[PDB]
Amino acid sequence: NATEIRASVGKMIDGIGRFYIQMCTELKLSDYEGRLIQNSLTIERMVLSAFDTGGPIYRRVDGKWRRELILYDKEEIRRIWRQANNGDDATAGLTHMMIWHSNLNDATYQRTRALVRTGMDPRMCSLMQGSTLPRRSGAAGAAVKGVGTMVMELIRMIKRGINRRTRIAYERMCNILKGKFQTAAQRTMVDQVRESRNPGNAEFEDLIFLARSALILRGSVAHKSCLPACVYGSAVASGYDFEREGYSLVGIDPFRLLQNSQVYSLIRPNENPAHKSQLVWMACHSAAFEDLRVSSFIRGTKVVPRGKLSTRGVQIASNENMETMESSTLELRSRYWAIRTRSGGNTSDMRTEIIRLMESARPEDVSFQGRGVFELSDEKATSPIVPSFDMSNEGSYFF
Amino acid sequence: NATEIRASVGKMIDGIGRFYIQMCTELKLSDYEGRLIQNSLTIERMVLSAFDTGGPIYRRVDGKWRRELILYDKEEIRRIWRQANNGDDATAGLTHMMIWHSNLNDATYQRTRALVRTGMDPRMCSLMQGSTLPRRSGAAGAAVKGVGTMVMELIRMIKRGINDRNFWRGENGRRTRIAYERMCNILKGKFQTAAQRTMVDQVRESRNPGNAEFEDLIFLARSALILRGSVAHKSCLPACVYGSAVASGYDFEREGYSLVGIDPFRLLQNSQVYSLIRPNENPAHKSQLVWMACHSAAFEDLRVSSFIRGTKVVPRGKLSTRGVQIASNENMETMESSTLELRSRYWAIRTRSGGNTSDMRTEIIRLMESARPEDVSFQGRGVFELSDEKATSPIVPSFDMSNEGSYFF
């Protein structure tokens, strides 16, 4: 059923577009200045703030870039927003940029300080997908969350409490949690946790276990390709009428759109452009915890690890100066595309059950058997391509 | 030094009187109206509601009485205040009003509602003195408050942080903690035994105050039942009286006034103060009340209470009167006004001491274990006559005559 799902989400994409265009028309920005991922970000956040303000806005004068600090009627923003969505709320829409930000943050930063202070192992990076994503996120907003993400929450919710209506949350938060697991025991053990009203260290220690079980017996976590507002604004302005022509966040749509996007970015004096583009590209698909090998394969070019990456962050801090600042054109095109999946793959004390399953598991264990990559011409999911990694690679752990 | 105090006191007294006058002179009152206790309380309230306004103002239509829910412009009241007060902000004066009320409050309502609530034993009245006094009252406010109240406010927080909204955390949390500490130090201050005091320190040294800390305070509170705490007793009078007093041109600023001496009794002695009373009550029973409230002798031994006064001071459970102020829910055509018997044969001085004698928990028990109700405190002090204006002839009474039921409540 390509009617609702493909076209209803198109309508949510149209809104973001239209809005971005309106909002650019207010700031009286130029074309080059509306394609500046920097300005786009600021706008996106102005809105999510107002629906739950001012921000940094960069301008282009003969030669150099001028940063403007501006403020807008928090309500005016809310007004312009609905105008674009037919006076609707389109929570989906706000939630969408709510994720684009997430996926950018899960790739720009490593959230160790928080994991440890929670009592999670810092090496549990690949499980913190969407830890930045405000709880306000929608129902299809949490589905993108990693197993580890959920645990950090419950553990804090529990840690302060064990240190009224709050209950329905906890059970559900677990049901979701449990719905991440895709194996008997995994599933069953979550229940054994959800049994206690005042779950103390008994649980505190057990979920942490299950957290680690997912490192081997992963769960189902959806990935959503959420592009910057500018990309959708520009597309809408170019005539693309997505609600009519349909759009996806896990199909070929997002890659194809990024195959023509003209996004620019501010870039510090010593930073590497190629390295900058990489970053953004990984935020456009939630590939911050993907196997670098595959990311590079699909990308078309080296996908260098975080450490070796030359950049501190896409947003420009108030600290920096504009004199020594310039801007490059972001390389967002990719070689092939792939169905962003949700599945994690698979081959007494319920712990034992898992520990026993954990064991038989080898890192070499092939997942998504038969699934492959698609050419950018292959609109339909017709012919798949299987990658062979016998190759001089460059790692697998972005972090 | 000593001559100063009395000046400021007078200075304050004077201000107050000067004020209540202006209020009468305002509402176009009379000698009578301006002496009715109920009318006074309404004023004082409004004088306080103006520094964070309305109340019932009583008038007499020959045959019956009148209510008039007066709403006087807030900012104006606080402005006539400085006028009457030389353009000084008499905050102390405003504190005097507050206390008068607290002391009239303890003398009427038994605060059990709140005790069982915070988990304190319902039998701790002896300790809940000055509890209705808001935080808005300074050091004066605290000196008056007692162990019960101090514990109560501490337990209130201990618990408020168990629901824990990060109660003791973050920039504001750290600010609360500071407060919690202050209050711990206030409690500790009142204690006379190092054991109690040292044991306070053991509680305020925690950072996750919970049941542990909680039970230790309930403990410290029982102890104050026998190892008396050191509390402050003052003599605060309805400003209607202070009005009449300045009337005579009695300049307290000169003549000096005090809140722990004879001066308070001197006024109440020559003073005409009425109060509205409903049917089925003994018009003397209200007198006791107001009188008690005036001296804060709500938790004083009924003996020393009934002796210090000429008549026999009866307990609450045989005092037919449900308070000074009057509700709006019931008949006002049956309001017999009466003159309050606010006099006493003898006057005594109010004091601070309670006459005083986890290892601390095991050791405090000893002291308690050692105390006896038959122990005499304040050896050497007695009651004085109104002719002995300079406390000099102690009349140390012989008490136990089987009329022992000193527990007002």
PDB file of all heavy atoms in Angstrom, chain B residues 266-292:
ATOM      1  N   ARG B 266       1.562  46.102  82.763  1.00  0.00           N
ATOM      2  CA  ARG B 266       1.108  47.442  83.177  1.00  0.00           C
ATOM      3  C   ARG B 266       0.018  47.942  82.277  1.00  0.00           C
ATOM      4  O   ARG B 266      -0.894  48.623  82.748  1.00  0.00           O
ATOM      5  CB  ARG B 266       2.269  48.459  83.295  1.00  0.00           C
ATOM      6  CG  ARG B 266       3.322  47.969  84.340  1.00  0.00           C
ATOM      7  CD  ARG B 266       4.660  48.670  84.270  1.00  0.00           C
ATOM      8  NE  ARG B 266       4.679  49.926  85.007  1.00  0.00           N
ATOM      9  CZ  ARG B 266       5.787  50.612  85.289  1.00  0.00           C
ATOM     10  NH1 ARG B 266       6.996  50.188  84.900  1.00  0.00           N
ATOM     11  NH2 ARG B 266       5.683  51.736  85.973  1.00  0.00           N
ATOM     12  N   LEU B 267       0.075  47.555  81.009  1.00  0.00           N
ATOM     13  CA  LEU B 267      -0.856  48.071  80.033  1.00  0.00           C
ATOM     14  C   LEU B 267      -2.137  47.289  80.111  1.00  0.00           C
ATOM     15  O   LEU B 267      -3.246  47.832  80.279  1.00  0.00           O
ATOM     16  CB  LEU B 267      -0.254  47.949  78.641  1.00  0.00           C
ATOM     17  CG  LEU B 267       0.680  49.083  78.237  1.00  0.00           C
ATOM     18  CD1 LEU B 267       1.839  49.282  79.274  1.00  0.00           C
ATOM     19  CD2 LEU B 267       1.186  48.847  76.805  1.00  0.00           C
ATOM     20  N   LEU B 268      -1.960  45.984  80.005  1.00  0.00           N
ATOM     21  CA  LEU B 268      -3.077  45.059  80.065  1.00  0.00           C
ATOM     22  C   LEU B 268      -3.889  45.269  81.340  1.00  0.00           C
ATOM     23  O   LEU B 268      -5.045  44.818  81.421  1.00  0.00           O
ATOM     24  CB  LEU B 268      -2.564  43.610  80.032  1.00  0.00           C
ATOM     25  CG  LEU B 268      -2.033  43.085  78.699  1.00  0.00           C
ATOM     26  CD1 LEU B 268      -1.614  41.643  78.867  1.00  0.00           C
ATOM     27  CD2 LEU B 268      -3.119  43.196  77.623  1.00  0.00           C
ATOM     28  N   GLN B 269      -3.251  45.944  82.312  1.00  0.00           N
ATOM     29  CA  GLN B 269      -3.814  46.173  83.629  1.00  0.00           C
ATOM     30  C   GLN B 269      -4.830  47.285  83.502  1.00  0.00           C
ATOM     31  O   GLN B 269      -6.022  47.120  83.852  1.00  0.00           O
ATOM     32  CB  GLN B 269      -2.716  46.566  84.605  1.00  0.00           C
ATOM     33  CG  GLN B 269      -3.101  46.341  86.056  1.00  0.00           C
ATOM     34  CD  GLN B 269      -3.323  44.897  86.412  1.00  0.00           C
ATOM     35  OE1 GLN B 269      -4.079  44.591  87.309  1.00  0.00           O
ATOM     36  NE2 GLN B 269      -2.648  44.005  85.728  1.00  0.00           N
ATOM     37  N   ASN B 270      -4.376  48.403  82.956  1.00  0.00           N
ATOM     38  CA  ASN B 270      -5.277  49.515  82.782  1.00  0.00           C
ATOM     39  C   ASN B 270      -5.804  49.500  81.367  1.00  0.00           C
ATOM     40  O   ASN B 270      -5.653  50.473  80.661  1.00  0.00           O
ATOM     41  CB  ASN B 270      -4.561  50.875  83.045  1.00  0.00           C
ATOM     42  CG  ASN B 270      -3.665  50.882  84.333  1.00  0.00           C
ATOM     43  OD1 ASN B 270      -2.800  51.784  84.521  1.00  0.00           O
ATOM     44  ND2 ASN B 270      -3.866  49.877  85.209  1.00  0.00           N
ATOM     45  N   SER B 271      -6.413  48.422  80.909  1.00  0.00           N
ATOM     46  CA  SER B 271      -6.790  48.437  79.495  1.00  0.00           C
ATOM     47  C   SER B 271      -8.142  47.870  79.198  1.00  0.00           C
ATOM     48  O   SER B 271      -8.522  46.829  79.737  1.00  0.00           O
ATOM     49  CB  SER B 271      -5.759  47.717  78.655  1.00  0.00           C
ATOM     50  OG  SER B 271      -5.729  46.363  79.049  1.00  0.00           O
ATOM     51  N   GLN B 272      -8.848  48.566  78.307  1.00  0.00           N
ATOM     52  CA  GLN B 272     -10.253  48.259  77.995  1.00  0.00           C
ATOM     53  C   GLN B 272     -10.331  47.595  76.637  1.00  0.00           C
ATOM     54  O   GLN B 272     -10.123  48.221  75.592  1.00  0.00           O
ATOM     55  CB  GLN B 272     -11.128  49.531  78.009  1.00  0.00           C
ATOM     56  CG  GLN B 272     -12.654  49.284  77.894  1.00  0.00           C
ATOM     57  CD  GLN B 272     -13.436  49.445  79.210  1.00  0.00           C
ATOM     58  OE1 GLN B 272     -13.239  48.713  80.203  1.00  0.00           O
ATOM     59  NE2 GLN B 272     -14.348  50.393  79.204  1.00  0.00           N
ATOM     60  N   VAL B 273     -10.644  46.312  76.639  1.00  0.00           N
ATOM     61  CA  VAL B 273     -10.540  45.568  75.399  1.00  0.00           C
ATOM     62  C   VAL B 273     -11.732  44.640  75.368  1.00  0.00           C
ATOM     63  O   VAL B 273     -11.858  43.753  76.238  1.00  0.00           O
ATOM     64  CB  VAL B 273      -9.245  44.718  75.388  1.00  0.00           C
ATOM     65  CG1 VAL B 273      -8.982  44.151  74.041  1.00  0.00           C
ATOM     66  CG2 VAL B 273      -8.058  45.518  75.875  1.00  0.00           C
ATOM     67  N   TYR B 274     -12.601  44.865  74.378  1.00  0.00           N
ATOM     68  CA  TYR B 274     -13.816  44.075  74.236  1.00  0.00           C
ATOM     69  C   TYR B 274     -13.595  42.939  73.268  1.00  0.00           C
ATOM     70  O   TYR B 274     -12.651  42.966  72.505  1.00  0.00           O
ATOM     71  CB  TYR B 274     -15.004  44.935  73.765  1.00  0.00           C
ATOM     72  CG  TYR B 274     -15.112  46.249  74.483  1.00  0.00           C
ATOM     73  CD1 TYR B 274     -14.397  47.363  74.017  1.00  0.00           C
ATOM     74  CD2 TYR B 274     -15.880  46.385  75.623  1.00  0.00           C
ATOM     75  CE1 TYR B 274     -14.445  48.601  74.661  1.00  0.00           C
ATOM     76  CE2 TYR B 274     -15.924  47.628  76.293  1.00  0.00           C
ATOM     77  CZ  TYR B 274     -15.198  48.735  75.798  1.00  0.00           C
ATOM     78  OH  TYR B 274     -15.209  49.972  76.415  1.00  0.00           O
ATOM     79  N   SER B 275     -14.471  41.940  73.318  1.00  0.00           N
ATOM     80  CA  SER B 275     -14.531  40.893  72.304  1.00  0.00           C
ATOM     81  C   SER B 275     -15.924  40.302  72.110  1.00  0.00           C
ATOM     82  O   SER B 275     -16.632  39.933  73.066  1.00  0.00           O
ATOM     83  CB  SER B 275     -13.540  39.751  72.594  1.00  0.00           C
ATOM     84  OG  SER B 275     -14.114  38.460  72.159  1.00  0.00           O
ATOM     85  N   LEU B 276     -16.276  40.142  70.853  1.00  0.00           N
ATOM     86  CA  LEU B 276     -17.515  39.508  70.519  1.00  0.00           C
ATOM     87  C   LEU B 276     -17.534  38.018  70.921  1.00  0.00           C
ATOM     88  O   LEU B 276     -16.576  37.277  70.651  1.00  0.00           O
ATOM     89  CB  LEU B 276     -17.745  39.675  69.017  1.00  0.00           C
ATOM     90  CG  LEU B 276     -17.642  41.086  68.412  1.00  0.00           C
ATOM     91  CD1 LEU B 276     -18.208  41.114  66.987  1.00  0.00           C
ATOM     92  CD2 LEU B 276     -18.430  42.028  69.270  1.00  0.00           C
ATOM     93  N   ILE B 277     -18.629  37.596  71.554  1.00  0.00           N
ATOM     94  CA  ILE B 277     -18.774  36.234  72.034  1.00  0.00           C
ATOM     95  C   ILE B 277     -20.137  35.674  71.651  1.00  0.00           C
ATOM     96  O   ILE B 277     -21.142  36.329  71.823  1.00  0.00           O
ATOM     97  CB  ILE B 277     -18.595  36.142  73.573  1.00  0.00           C
ATOM     98  CG1 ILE B 277     -19.021  34.744  74.053  1.00  0.00           C
ATOM     99  CG2 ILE B 277     -19.341  37.257  74.306  1.00  0.00           C
ATOM    100  CD1 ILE B 277     -19.119  34.506  75.589  1.00  0.00           C
ATOM    101  N   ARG B 278     -20.177  34.457  71.130  1.00  0.00           N
ATOM    102  CA  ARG B 278     -21.439  33.802  70.776  1.00  0.00           C
ATOM    103  C   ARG B 278     -22.125  33.195  72.036  1.00  0.00           C
ATOM    104  O   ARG B 278     -21.453  32.992  73.060  1.00  0.00           O
ATOM    105  CB  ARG B 278     -21.165  32.709  69.723  1.00  0.00           C
ATOM    106  CG  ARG B 278     -20.127  31.622  70.138  1.00  0.00           C
ATOM    107  CD  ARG B 278     -19.697  30.662  68.988  1.00  0.00           C
ATOM    108  NE  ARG B 278     -19.026  31.365  67.882  1.00  0.00           N
ATOM    109  CZ  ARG B 278     -17.703  31.548  67.773  1.00  0.00           C
ATOM    110  NH1 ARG B 278     -16.879  31.046  68.694  1.00  0.00           N
ATOM    111  NH2 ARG B 278     -17.199  32.222  66.732  1.00  0.00           N
ATOM    112  N   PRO B 279     -23.452  32.876  71.960  1.00  0.00           N
ATOM    113  CA  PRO B 279     -24.170  32.252  73.088  1.00  0.00           C
ATOM    114  C   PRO B 279     -23.536  30.960  73.490  1.00  0.00           C
ATOM    115  O   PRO B 279     -22.755  30.396  72.740  1.00  0.00           O
ATOM    116  CB  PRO B 279     -25.551  31.945  72.499  1.00  0.00           C
ATOM    117  CG  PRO B 279     -25.295  31.854  71.002  1.00  0.00           C
ATOM    118  CD  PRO B 279     -24.341  33.001  70.786  1.00  0.00           C
ATOM    119  N   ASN B 280     -23.897  30.484  74.668  1.00  0.00           N
ATOM    120  CA  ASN B 280     -23.483  29.153  75.157  1.00  0.00           C
ATOM    121  C   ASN B 280     -21.986  29.029  75.513  1.00  0.00           C
ATOM    122  O   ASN B 280     -21.407  27.937  75.492  1.00  0.00           O
ATOM    123  CB  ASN B 280     -23.941  28.062  74.172  1.00  0.00           C
ATOM    124  CG  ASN B 280     -25.462  27.972  74.085  1.00  0.00           C
ATOM    125  OD1 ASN B 280     -26.016  27.029  73.489  1.00  0.00           O
ATOM    126  ND2 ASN B 280     -26.152  28.960  74.689  1.00  0.00           N
ATOM    127  N   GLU B 281     -21.382  30.166  75.852  1.00  0.00           N
ATOM    128  CA  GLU B 281     -19.963  30.248  76.179  1.00  0.00           C
ATOM    129  C   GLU B 281     -19.884  31.062  77.440  1.00  0.00           C
ATOM    130  O   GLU B 281     -20.765  31.885  77.695  1.00  0.00           O
ATOM    131  CB  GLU B 281     -19.186  30.979  75.079  1.00  0.00           C
ATOM    132  CG  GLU B 281     -19.519  30.524  73.657  1.00  0.00           C
ATOM    133  CD  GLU B 281     -18.497  31.014  72.647  1.00  0.00           C
ATOM    134  OE1 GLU B 281     -18.270  32.246  72.537  1.00  0.00           O
ATOM    135  OE2 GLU B 281     -17.917  30.159  71.944  1.00  0.00           O
ATOM    136  N   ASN B 282     -18.837  30.827  78.228  1.00  0.00           N
ATOM    137  CA  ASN B 282     -18.590  31.581  79.454  1.00  0.00           C
ATOM    138  C   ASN B 282     -17.728  32.794  79.081  1.00  0.00           C
ATOM    139  O   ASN B 282     -16.604  32.645  78.626  1.00  0.00           O
ATOM    140  CB  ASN B 282     -17.889  30.679  80.483  1.00  0.00           C
ATOM    141  CG  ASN B 282     -17.908  31.253  81.883  1.00  0.00           C
ATOM    142  OD1 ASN B 282     -17.591  30.558  82.846  1.00  0.00           O
ATOM    143  ND2 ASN B 282     -18.305  32.527  82.009  1.00  0.00           N
ATOM    144  N   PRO B 283     -18.260  34.004  79.244  1.00  0.00           N
ATOM    145  CA  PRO B 283     -17.580  35.252  78.851  1.00  0.00           C
ATOM    146  C   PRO B 283     -16.242  35.487  79.527  1.00  0.00           C
ATOM    147  O   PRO B 283     -15.503  36.394  79.148  1.00  0.00           O
ATOM    148  CB  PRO B 283     -18.567  36.331  79.274  1.00  0.00           C
ATOM    149  CG  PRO B 283     -19.880  35.616  79.244  1.00  0.00           C
ATOM    150  CD  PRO B 283     -19.591  34.270  79.800  1.00  0.00           C
ATOM    151  N   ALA B 284     -15.955  34.676  80.537  1.00  0.00           N
ATOM    152  CA  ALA B 284     -14.659  34.686  81.205  1.00  0.00           C
ATOM    153  C   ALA B 284     -13.681  33.739  80.502  1.00  0.00           C
ATOM    154  O   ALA B 284     -12.472  33.968  80.520  1.00  0.00           O
ATOM    155  CB  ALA B 284     -14.822  34.276  82.684  1.00  0.00           C
ATOM    156  N   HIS B 285     -14.217  32.670  79.908  1.00  0.00           N
ATOM    157  CA  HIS B 285     -13.424  31.700  79.157  1.00  0.00           C
ATOM    158  C   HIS B 285     -12.661  32.320  77.984  1.00  0.00           C
ATOM    159  O   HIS B 285     -11.554  31.858  77.645  1.00  0.00           O
ATOM    160  CB  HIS B 285     -14.314  30.565  78.649  1.00  0.00           C
ATOM    161  CG  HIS B 285     -14.766  29.638  79.728  1.00  0.00           C
ATOM    162  ND1 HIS B 285     -14.283  29.711  81.021  1.00  0.00           N
ATOM    163  CD2 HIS B 285     -15.624  28.587  79.707  1.00  0.00           C
ATOM    164  CE1 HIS B 285     -14.816  28.745  81.748  1.00  0.00           C
ATOM    165  NE2 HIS B 285     -15.634  28.046  80.973  1.00  0.00           N
ATOM    166  N   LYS B 286     -13.257  33.336  77.346  1.00  0.00           N
ATOM    167  CA  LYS B 286     -12.558  34.087  76.288  1.00  0.00           C
ATOM    168  C   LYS B 286     -11.458  34.916  76.928  1.00  0.00           C
ATOM    169  O   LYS B 286     -10.379  35.047  76.366  1.00  0.00           O
ATOM    170  CB  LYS B 286     -13.499  34.985  75.451  1.00  0.00           C
ATOM    171  CG  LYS B 286     -14.086  34.328  74.200  1.00  0.00           C
ATOM    172  CD  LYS B 286     -14.595  35.367  73.181  1.00  0.00           C
ATOM    173  CE  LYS B 286     -15.136  34.654  71.909  1.00  0.00           C
ATOM    174  NZ  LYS B 286     -16.180  33.576  72.122  1.00  0.00           N
ATOM    175  N   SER B 287     -11.720  35.451  78.111  1.00  0.00           N
ATOM    176  CA  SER B 287     -10.744  36.314  78.788  1.00  0.00           C
ATOM    177  C   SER B 287      -9.437  35.563  78.981  1.00  0.00           C
ATOM    178  O   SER B 287      -8.363  36.055  78.602  1.00  0.00           O
ATOM    179  CB  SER B 287     -11.261  36.793  80.148  1.00  0.00           C
ATOM    180  OG  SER B 287     -12.561  37.348  80.035  1.00  0.00           O
ATOM    181  N   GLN B 288      -9.553  34.366  79.561  1.00  0.00           N
ATOM    182  CA  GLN B 288      -8.415  33.487  79.823  1.00  0.00           C
ATOM    183  C   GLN B 288      -7.571  33.456  78.519  1.00  0.00           C
ATOM    184  O   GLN B 288      -6.380  33.834  78.494  1.00  0.00           O
ATOM    185  CB  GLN B 288      -8.922  32.079  80.221  1.00  0.00           C
ATOM    186  CG  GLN B 288      -7.816  31.116  80.524  1.00  0.00           C
ATOM    187  CD  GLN B 288      -8.277  29.802  81.143  1.00  0.00           C
ATOM    188  OE1 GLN B 288      -8.718  29.743  82.308  1.00  0.00           O
ATOM    189  NE2 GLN B 288      -8.145  28.719  80.371  1.00  0.00           N
ATOM    190  N   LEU B 289      -8.259  33.050  77.438  1.00  0.00           N
ATOM    191  CA  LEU B 289      -7.737  32.855  76.096  1.00  0.00           C
ATOM    192  C   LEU B 289      -6.925  34.031  75.653  1.00  0.00           C
ATOM    193  O   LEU B 289      -5.702  33.945  75.547  1.00  0.00           O
ATOM    194  CB  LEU B 289      -8.905  32.679  75.142  1.00  0.00           C
ATOM    195  CG  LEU B 289      -8.573  32.032  73.802  1.00  0.00           C
ATOM    196  CD1 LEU B 289      -7.908  30.633  73.970  1.00  0.00           C
ATOM    197  CD2 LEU B 289      -9.856  31.951  72.985  1.00  0.00           C
ATOM    198  N   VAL B 290      -7.597  35.131  75.391  1.00  0.00           N
ATOM    199  CA  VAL B 290      -6.880  36.326  75.051  1.00  0.00           C
ATOM    200  C   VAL B 290      -5.741  36.577  76.014  1.00  0.00           C
ATOM    201  O   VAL B 290      -4.624  36.826  75.597  1.00  0.00           O
ATOM    202  CB  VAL B 290      -7.813  37.514  75.095  1.00  0.00           C
ATOM    203  CG1 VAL B 290      -7.110  38.807  74.556  1.00  0.00           C
ATOM    204  CG2 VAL B 290      -9.112  37.205  74.302  1.00  0.00           C
ATOM    205  N   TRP B 291      -6.031  36.515  77.312  1.00  0.00           N
ATOM    206  CA  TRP B 291      -5.001  36.737  78.347  1.00  0.00           C
ATOM    207  C   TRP B 291      -3.837  35.805  78.062  1.00  0.00           C
ATOM    208  O   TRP B 291      -2.753  36.291  77.872  1.00  0.00           O
ATOM    209  CB  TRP B 291      -5.542  36.509  79.783  1.00  0.00           C
ATOM    210  CG  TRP B 291      -4.513  36.708  80.869  1.00  0.00           C
ATOM    211  CD1 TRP B 291      -4.169  37.894  81.488  1.00  0.00           C
ATOM    212  CD2 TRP B 291      -3.674  35.716  81.419  1.00  0.00           C
ATOM    213  NE1 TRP B 291      -3.155  37.684  82.381  1.00  0.00           N
ATOM    214  CE2 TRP B 291      -2.837  36.353  82.363  1.00  0.00           C
ATOM    215  CE3 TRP B 291      -3.543  34.351  81.210  1.00  0.00           C
ATOM    216  CZ2 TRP B 291      -1.879  35.661  83.095  1.00  0.00           C
ATOM    217  CZ3 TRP B 291      -2.608  33.654  81.953  1.00  0.00           C
ATOM    218  CH2 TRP B 291      -1.770  34.320  82.874  1.00  0.00           C
ATOM    219  N   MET B 292      -4.070  34.492  78.008  1.00  0.00           N
ATOM    220  CA  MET B 292      -3.021  33.532  77.686  1.00  0.00           C
ATOM    221  C   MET B 292      -2.244  33.911  76.442  1.00  0.00           C
ATOM    222  O   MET B 292      -1.025  34.001  76.488  1.00  0.00           O
ATOM    223  CB  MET B 292      -3.588  32.133  77.491  1.00  0.00           C
ATOM    224  CG  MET B 292      -4.537  31.750  78.560  1.00  0.00           C
ATOM    225  SD  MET B 292      -5.070  30.056  78.486  1.00  0.00           S
ATOM    226  CE  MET B 292      -3.880  29.273  79.519  1.00  0.00           C
TER     227      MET B 292
END
